[model samples]
Target chain A: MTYNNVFDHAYEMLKENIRYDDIRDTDDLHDAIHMAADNAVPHYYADIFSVMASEGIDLEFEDSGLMPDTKDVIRILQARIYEQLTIDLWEDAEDLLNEYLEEVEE
Target chain B: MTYNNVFDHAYEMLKENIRYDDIRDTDDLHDAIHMAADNAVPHYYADIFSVMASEGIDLEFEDSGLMPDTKDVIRILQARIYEQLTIDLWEDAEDLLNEYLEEVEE
Candidate 1:
């Protein structure tokens, strides 16, 4: 109920609104937004990607113009994994959050 | 045991190098790898660049990534969010990160 640490409160609010898989950094926010564009999730933007992003891409098309393997790999790689997230991700984050909340609450 | 659900094994491997944050299917691995290439961490990779480039640097070519608007913007983002993170973002991510781990560990 009481947390001296602000994150605890933040977590409480986030759990309901945000889906665990959509979480990412701030810079990656745009990508995540683009990711959630067709499909959607609660606080889809509520992620570390929502804050941070780095850079780079692929070199698969170099050989023969393209092939199904490369295309499938690229598509899979290019895809997001929110759907892959099971209850494990959400449950785990809560535990980790509580630990920090306890430590930082002072 | 046999995964009757084969992805369980894959999830275990995926969770290994692919961090909770670093683990964005595969499209973002480039970004995640970029984040890790230097100032690597379990988290806040964007901040890793920000603080180091802002106050931590003595020499800049004038900057390095591995090179930086880059300098001034980073400084303010660092300072401004040092305020908000304590209150908001930091706690939020920690929880989210934790939640993801619990499910995949199985």
Candidate 2:
């Protein structure tokens, strides 16, 4: 299916790859990524603490202490979205190449 | 004031500089830019036509003929939002510089 615009294209990926309840029916990519980041942030910090615990690096996990700079986290989250979209596009292109190979095999 | 996140910072710019009826309360950057582009697209193409008319270049303006590739248009539109945001930030930095100059004059 053809995307109407970048908004449409990004919407599809955000919906399929990163599920956010607030993300549906929105045309804004920043909103979607931020909501996704909000949803992910708690786990993100917790995951880091979890790894620290496993590594025997003990530190008290206060929410304030665990919290990262919001701008940095948002950048990381947004980068992930772009990274996945690129990978998805590459996979689609690879599928097209495979289809061409199959046709040439005949 | 320090922004809570990029979303908050962008929301401020989107609301203040580019007034869109539907842009409020969104965390998504992509959606905001896309909405702004949608709002701007008609004027954008029409402006081009107006310039062409002034130059004595005649061409029939059909919506289909004037419509650009969505992805490319979106990229351009998104770039413009970023460009403005950069300028806004630079202006803010300049204000800070002016403040320092005033302090030194004291």
Candidate 3:
């Protein structure tokens, strides 16, 4: 699927699961939506990560010790919720081709 | 301070510390650059959080039990590196007012 298409589907999925009126405020709604999306997007890219890692891409870990590069990809996907895109999207697409390096270690 | 100002300064800071040429690929460069900014931006908003919490706002935590609300604000600031903004930014700004709520506990 095109990046834009993935974004639209993710946005629609989020909108369906969350009732904005149920949120106390936009902050609550925003947090709920983002958290929901973050969890869900990984499933969409589960295979892509393996494909990319096989191509020799090194995903950087953040100070928090999480994959910032991986997170960046999701950010781009989330950005599309509002029809926005950024340099990170291109960066993430490239990294998606190198996901094999992220294989589970015994 | 304006969100734009915060973003500009952050981009400059990341650019200065990271020499893209030193990285093997754009993926590594993107990862390093993003990790640097994520660390720096929280320091920028250290005070804003306290002021916001005094006003009564609810910041939601993520499934990972981290403050996804706080993370959303950083994502907005990061988005500014490429001159894009999103609904999350406004939501995060509102949450900043509730920072007092994030105080260290015994």
TM-score leader: 3
Q: Tell me the lDDT of model 1 at A85.
A: 26
Tens-digit per-residue lDDT, A1-106, candidate 1: 1111222333344443334444433332333333332232223222222212222212122333222333222132222222222222344455544543455443
Q: TM-scores of the models, in the given order?
A: 0.16, 0.17, 0.23
Candidate 1's interface RMSD, please? 10.7
**TM-score, ranked from best to worst:** 3, 2, 1
Going through the candidates in order, the fraction of native interface contacts each one reproduces equals 0.10, 0.00, 0.00
Better by DockQ, candidate 3 or 2: 3
What does candidate 3's lDDT look like per residue over A2-106, in tens digits?
A: 334444444554444444333333333444455544543434342232222232222222223322334454443233322222222323332332332343477
Model 2 TM-score on a 0 to 1 scale? 0.17
Tens digits of lDDT, candidate 2, A1-106: 1112322454344454334333222233344444433333223332322222232112222233333344232233234333433334443433433443455442
True contacts kept of 1: 0.10
Residue ranges of candidate 3 with Cα displaced over 4 Å: A1-106, B42-106
lDDT of 2 by residue, B1-106 (tens): 1112322455355444434343222233345444433443223332322222232112222233333344232233233333443334443443433443455442
**For model 3, what is the alpha-carbon lDDT of residue B86?**
22
Total colliding residue pairs, candidate 2: 12
Q: Please give the DockQ score of every candidate, comma-separated.
A: 0.05, 0.01, 0.01
Candidate 1's docking class is incorrect
On lDDT, the candidate that comes out on top is 3
